């Protein structure tokens, strides 16, 4: 119940929300059908429209008008945004030359530059260039401020997950808004685009920017706008709030536009109908900037122009139907569209089986336009698994396509031509970032970055301490003129042991064999130097990774590679080696095919054994440092040490051997040498974070050798490829991957073919940031470079996407 008989007199767009049944006058009362009876008359005035005209100038104030052109309107803070232009001979902001804002220029009583977030739904990144001729105000923000060529949204590339990511810095699996539609099995409740469940605070986790601000004594405008409040009124309300007295005035504000998404869905991303909504957004920016100029705030306020996701061409004829795959289609519930999520239709149906569903959806039709995954097998870069609202079975849908359950869903719910939601590396999903203001840099282009980084920067812009989030604070300091956040590198928690030769060959009973008993003061001192680390500077180029948790491990040196060997997990946490452009690939010699060699530095009790592999019929082994890239026949024996061995399913060894035998050398060729750090990942609870020992669900049969869920590699070179990776004076270049360690190659439908036709494609799908690897391993990389620390943070957040040009 709302007793709508109260009044909005002097309450229009009030910032405090009054509680039921008292009637509301805030910018959301419409969405709750709770506004006071006179809210439209008083708060949504439209008379005479939104623009001053010559004959209105100096008019007698008429309080009924939507906005004013009377002499008192500046002091009342309610002029039409074009008032000084029409009536006082001023220029529109867009018409003024851009001039650097070196310091804030704020009216007295302003304690800090306010922040205004101008949020545009479905604003595809390439609109900034492709629509530039019809967006002069936005083009001026972009060219005169700080801009990225695109900003990467989070997956799924849907509105609710992305806006709530922008406000919290959190992945949707963490904040809990994992789609536009959701079922929470603990609540037994459904969240929908339409209806009243979505306003229940229990859905929304983390701490959004307006809560962070309020807790720290920084007042906030309301961030949400009812769809029926016209955009001109939204702008006027913000400008009115900015004329509040100092003690009452917010420091952070948000505007929202439902366009261009609304039209993009109807017309496609580049339909001829799309020019007009771009013109209209630009005009609204122009209103804001003109309004700020009138208040003498246009060189005081920081403005962020930001989108949530892009828009792709999708039509209802490009829909895949589960009813062409599944016998039991009526036994499942599908969340459909540009992603699929499947769960049992009834929890009382004991004939539901996710394995038979996955199998029936796997590589069934030659051109099939979606791929099924258990959520733990999705690319780790999507960070889309650790939430009970994310169904176990996921369909990744190809760009331009939909998935639906049955054809009747699509015609008896087709006119739509655009949609979004796909993989967040897809070019059509990328969106926009521009920042303009005293705190942002001047005429500066920054590389693309992820929207999970923005909350930290928004906190910086406002002097707030951010709540714990998934950004890497400092990774965007290069966007900022001032207020940068200068972090210190985390302290190493575990120091390594440096074991020398401690065990005789006969102390080992590992069941391994090697034909190496084939036999010099020249060469012997040399090989002792290698075991003491004399080649370490060439293979460990950026310092040893720091271990940020408590464990026991050994540094092992070799001619060709250095490793940090875990006594707890019986294998390296990391293996680091450098391959120059001149390196030669060689075979594993016939007599060495099955060679594994005890490591006389490491006790038998902390070693793997070969018998466990012989006896585990499902599990084989591979090596982290590749025997194919040994520097000499003699150095090659080091690659067969038991301390360089890792457990690998035979199907996985196909991928790994092709990476090591072919792809490493290709990258060294293309990049002028590469440094590679490889290792295992254990993430059996799919939380994106390093497992402890007691979370490991699988061991090599009969043994304490834990099976990795993934293997990573970090592949670093000189950004200026005219210098070789090992003599790089400047910024670095990196690509990394986190490959799932799976017992089949069912993910790759072309896997019966030669590895040259599918392996690299798999690796590209599983591209990752170095930061993703850090979370998964508790290691901290790039500890010793000549680069600034924030530069390194940027490098660690880089994702190599392999998409063509935006
Ligand atoms: C991205 O950034 C985020 C933010 O930094 C990272 O997320 C954090 O990760 C931490 C570790 O996983 C985690 O810390 C835990 O906090 C628990 C207390 O939980 C509440 O309090 C916090 C703080 O206010 C709050 O934010 C939480 O919010 C979660 O849950 C609510 C309601 O369910 C949601 O609305 C909200 O969206 C959020 O859900 C997300 O996180 C939870 C995990 O908490 C997931 O379950 C969800 O699916 C979703 O992703 C909570 O309201 C605390 O209880 C934990 O402590 C346990 O473990 C430690 C080990 O150190 C130990 O001290 C205790 O023994 C304890 O164990 C006991 O409970 C076990 C489980 O029942 C049981 O098995 C044992 O036997 C014990 O009884 C833990 O310290 C922190 O909560 C989140 N924060 C957020 C916002 O997500 C994220 O990791 C980053 N991602 C990457 C990849 O880097
Ligand atoms: C009832 N009416 C609406 O909700 C309209 N609406 C759309 C919407 C839909 C789902 C989730 C959030 C929002 C928020 C959107 N506001 C904005 O984007 C302005 C900036 C902003 C605000 C909030 C958040 Cl969480 C993040 C950001 Cl960057 C807004 O007002
Ligand atoms: Ca884990
Ligand atoms: Na085996
Ligand atoms: Na296959
Ligand atoms: Zn949309």
UniProtKB/Swiss-Prot annotation:
N-glycosylation, but not furin-cleavage, plays a critical role on secretion and on lysoPLD activity. Changing residue 265 to Q: 20% of wild-type lysophospholipase D activity. Residues 94-447 are annotated as: Phosphodiesterase. Its EC number is 3.1.4.39, 3.1.4.4. 1-tetradecanoyl-sn-glycerol 3-phosphate binds at residues 159, 180, 261, 420. Its cofactor is Zn(2+); Ca(2+). GO terms for molecular function: alkylglycerophosphoethanolamine phosphodiesterase activity; calcium ion binding; lysophospholipase activity; nucleic acid binding; phosphodiesterase I activity; phospholipase D activity; polysaccharide binding; scavenger receptor activity. Disulfide bonds join 8-25, 12-43, 23-36, 29-35, 52-69, 57-87, 67-80, 73-79, 98-144, 106-300, 316-414, 363-749, 512-610, 514-595, 718-728. Pfam families: Endonuclease_NS, Phosphodiest, Somatomedin_B. PANTHER family: ECTONUCLEOTIDE PYROPHOSPHATASE/PHOSPHODIESTERASE, ECTONUCLEOTIDE PYROPHOSPHATASE_PHOSPHODIESTERASE FAMILY MEMBER 2. This is Autotaxin. It comes from Rattus norvegicus.
């Amino acid at each position: 119940w709302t007793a709508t008989s109260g009044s909005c007199k002097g309450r229009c767009f009030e910032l405090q929300e009054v509680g039921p049944p008292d009637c509301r006058c805030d910018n959301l009362c419409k969405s709750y059908s709770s506004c006071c009876h006179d809210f439209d008359e008083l708060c949504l005035k439209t008379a005479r429209g939104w623009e001053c005209t010559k004959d209105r100038c100096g008019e007698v104030r008429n309080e009924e008008n939507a906005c004013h052109c009377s002499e008192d309107c500046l002091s009342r803070g309610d002029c039409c945004t074009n008032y000084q232009v029409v009536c006082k001979g001023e220029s529109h902001w867009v018409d003024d030359d851009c001039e650097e804002i070196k310091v804030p220029e704020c009216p007295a009583g302003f304690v800090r530059p306010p922040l205004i977030i101008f949020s545009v739904d479905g604003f595809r990144a390439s609109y900034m260039k492709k629509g530039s001729k019809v967006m002069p105000n936005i083009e001026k923000l972009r060219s005169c401020g700080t801009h990225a060529p695109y900003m990467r949204p989070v997956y799924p590339t849907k509105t609710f997950p992305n806006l709530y990511t922008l406000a919290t810095g959190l992945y949707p699996e963490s904040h809990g808004i994992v789609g536009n539609s959701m079922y929470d099995p603990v609540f037994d409740a459904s969240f929908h685009l339409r209806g009243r469940e979505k306003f229940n605070h229990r859905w929304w986790g983390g701490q959004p920017l307006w809560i962070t601000a309020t807790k720290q004594g920084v007042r906030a405008g309301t961030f949400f706008w009812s769809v029926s409040i016209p955009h001109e009124r939204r702008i006027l309300t913000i400008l009115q709030w900015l004329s509040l007295p100092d003690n009452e005035r917010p420091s952070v504000y948000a505007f929202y536009s439902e366009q261009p998404d609304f039209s993009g869905h109807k017309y496609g991303p580049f339909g001829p109908e799309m020019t007009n909504p771009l013109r209209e957004i630009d005009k609204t920016v122009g209103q804001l900037m003109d309004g700020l100029k009138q208040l003498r705030l246009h060189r005081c306020v920081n403005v962020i122009f930001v989108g949530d996701h892009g828009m792709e061409d999708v039509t209802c004829d490009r829909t895949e139907f589960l009813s062409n795959y599944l016998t039991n289609v009526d036994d499942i519930t599908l969340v459909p569209g540009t992603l699929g999520r499947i769960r049992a239709k009834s929890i009382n149906n004991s004939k539901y089986d996710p394995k038979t569903i996955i199998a029936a959806l796997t590589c069934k039709k030659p051109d099939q336009h979606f791929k099924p995954y258990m959520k733990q097998h999705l690319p780790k870069r999507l960070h889309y698994a650790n939430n009970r609202r994310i169904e176990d079975i996921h369909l990744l849908v190809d760009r331009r396509w939909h998935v639906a359950r049955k054809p009747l869903d699509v015609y008896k719910k087709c006119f739509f031509q655009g949609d979004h939601g796909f993989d967040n590396k897809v070019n059509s999903m990328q969106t926009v970032f521009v920042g303009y203001g005293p705190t942002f840099k001047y005429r500066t282009k920054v590389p693309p970055f992820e929207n999970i980084e923005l909350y930290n920067v928004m906190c910086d812009l406002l002097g707030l301490k951010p709540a714990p989030n998934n950004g890497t604070h400092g990774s965007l300091n290069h966007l900022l003129r001032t207020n940068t956040f200068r972090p210190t590198m985390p302290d190493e928690v575990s120091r390594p042991n440096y074991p020398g030769i401690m065990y005789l060959q006969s102390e080992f009973d590992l069941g391994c064999t090697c034909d190496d008993k084939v036999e010099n003061k020249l060469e012997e001192l040399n090989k002792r130097l290698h075991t003491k680390g004399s080649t370490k500077e060439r293979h460990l180029l950026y310092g040893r990774p720091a271990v940020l948790y408590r464990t026991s491990y050994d540094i092992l040196y070799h001619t060709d590679f250095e490793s940090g060997y875990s006594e707890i997990f019986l294998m390296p946490l990391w293996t680091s080696y450098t391959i120059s452009k001149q390196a030669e690939v060689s075979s594993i010699p016939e007599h060495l095919t099955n060679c594994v060699r005890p490591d006389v530095r490491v006790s038998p009790g902390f070693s793997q054994n070969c018998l466990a592999y012989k006896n585990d019929k499902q599990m084989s082994y591979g090596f982290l440092f590749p025997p194919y890239l040994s520097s000499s026949p003699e150095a090659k024996y080091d690659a067969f040490l038991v301390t360089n061995m890792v457990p690998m399913y035979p199907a996985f060894k196909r991928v790994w051997a092709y990476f090591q035998r072919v792809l490493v050398k290709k990258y060294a060729s293309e990049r002028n040498g590469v440094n590679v750090i490889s290792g295992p990942i254990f993430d059996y609870n799919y939380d994106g974070l390093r497992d402890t020992e007691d979370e490991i669900k699988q061991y090599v049969e009969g043994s304490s050798i834990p099976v990795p869920t993934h293997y990573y590699s970090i592949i670093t070179s000189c950004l200026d490829f005219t210098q070789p990776a090992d003599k790089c004076d400047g910024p670095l270049s990196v690509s990394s991957f986190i490959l799932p360690h799976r017992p089949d190659n069912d993910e790759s439908c072309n896997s019966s073919e030669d590895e040259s036709k599918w392996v690299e494609e798999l690796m590209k799908m599983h591209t990752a940031r170095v930061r993703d690897i850090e979370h998964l391993t508790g290691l901290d990389f790039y500890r010793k470079t000549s680069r600034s620390y924030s530069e390194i943070l940027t490098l660690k957040t880089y994702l190599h996407t392999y998409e063509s040009e935006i």
